[PDB]
Design a protein around this ligand. Structure first.
Ligand code: F9N
Length: 267
C-alpha cells in the first residue's frame, strides 16, 4: 500500500489492491483487482511491452487501445483506463463475474453433456451485436476465441477486446500472410459457433501437426455437426463463415440477422 493519489482516478496502480491472478498469460497477466476510490472491482492486464516491444510497436499498440476506448456496448467489456507504470503497460477493464466460455466448453465436455441449440443462440446472438458494434465503428477485434468470451452472472456475454497489428482460430488469409481484414473476424466467429455445438475447434485431431492443419483450412475439411440436435440453418451459417475465400463469407450484419431470427424461434 503506497501513497494513493485520488486525483489520477484509475490512472495509477496506487489506486488498486490486486486480489488474485485471475489471468492465464503467456503475453499477459490479468488480475482481479479492487479500486480504493469507489470500490468498483475491475480486471488489470499487465502487458510486458517494457523491452519486448520496439518503440514503433509501442506507438500503434497504444493507438489501438485508444480506439478500444471509442466503444460502449453492453456485450463488450468496457475500457476503464490505460497507462504506463513500472515501464509495464497496465490496462484496466471491466471484470466479468461468472466466468469464461472456454472454461465452460470444457465444463460441458467434462460432463459429456452437449449444449442445446436453444442456448447457443442465446449467447451467440449477443456476440454478433457486439462485433457488429466494433465493425460498426471500423474496429477489428483481432482475437475472437472462446478464452476471450466471458459471461456475467446475469447472463450477458462480454466480448474481450484484445489485438495486434498459435492463435486459437487461424485464418486462411493469415496462413498465406495475405493480411487480416474484417471478414477474418467472420472466420473465427464461425469456428467459435462450431466449437459451442461441437465442444472443440473445427480443425483439430490427435495428429496435432501444423502442416496438415492448414491444408485442411484452405480445403475446408472439418467434421460435420450432428444434424439430430443442430438445425440446418446453424450448420449452414457456420459453413458460410468459414469459406476459405473471404469474399464469399457473409457481412457481419447478415450473421447478426440470422442469429436474431432464430433466437426468437428458439425460445
Ligand atoms: C474456478 N472458479 C470457481 C473460481 C472463481 C473465479 N472467480 S473470478 O475471480 O471473479 C474470475 C475468474 C476468471 C475469469 C474472470 N473474469 C474475467 N477474466 C479475465 O481475464 C481472463 C484471461 C485474460 C485473457 C486470456 C486468458 C483469460 C478478464 N479480462 C478482462 N475481463 C475479464 N474478466 C473472473
Amino acid at each position: 500500500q503506497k501513497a494513493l493519489r485520488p486525483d489520477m482516478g484509475y490512472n495509477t496502480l496506487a489506486n488498486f489492491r490486486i486480489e488474485k491472478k485471475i489471468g492465464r498469460g503467456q503475453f499477459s497477466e490479468v488480475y482481479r483487482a479492487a479500486c480504493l476510490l469507489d470500490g468498483v472491482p475491475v480486471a488489470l492486464k499487465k502487458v510486458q511491452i517494457f523491452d519486448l516491444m520496439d518503440a514503433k510497436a509501442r506507438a500503434d499498440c497504444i493507438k489501438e487501445i485508444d480506439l478500444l476506448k471509442q466503444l460502449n456496448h453492453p456485450n463488450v467489456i468496457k475500457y476503464y483506463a490505460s497507462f504506463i507504470e513500472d515501464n509495464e503497460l497496465n490496462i484496466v477493464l471491466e471484470l466479468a463475474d461468472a466466468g469464461d466460455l472456454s472454461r465452460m466448453i470444457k465444463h460441458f465436455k467434462k460432463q459429456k453433456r452437449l449444449i442445446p441449440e436453444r442456448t447457443v443462440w442465446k449467447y451467440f446472438v449477443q456476440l454478433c451485436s457486439a462485433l457488429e458494434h466494433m465493425h460498426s465503428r471500423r474496429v477489428m477485434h483481432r482475437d475472437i476465441k472462446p478464452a476471450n468470451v466471458f459471461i456475467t452472472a446475469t447472463g450477458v456475454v462480454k466480448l474481450g477486446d484484445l489485438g495486434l497489428g498459435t492463435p486459437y482460430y487461424m485464418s486462411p488469409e493469415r496462413i498465406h500472410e495475405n493480411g487480416y481484414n474484417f471478414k477474418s473476424d467472420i472466420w473465427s466467429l464461425g469456428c467459435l459457433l462450431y466449437e459451442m455445438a461441437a465442444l472443440q475447434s473445427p480443425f483439430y485431431g490427435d495428429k496435432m501437426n501444423l502442416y496438415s492443419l492448414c491444408k485442411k483450412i484452405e480445403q475446408c475439411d472439418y467434421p460435420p455437426l450432428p444434424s439430430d440436435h443442430y438445425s440446418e440453418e446453424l450448420r449452414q451459417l457456420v459453413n458460410m463463415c468459414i469459406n476459405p475465400d473471404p469474399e464469399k463469407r457473409p457481412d457481419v450484419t447478415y450473421v447478426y440477422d440470422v442469429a436474431k431470427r432464430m433466437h426468437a424461434c428458439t425460445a
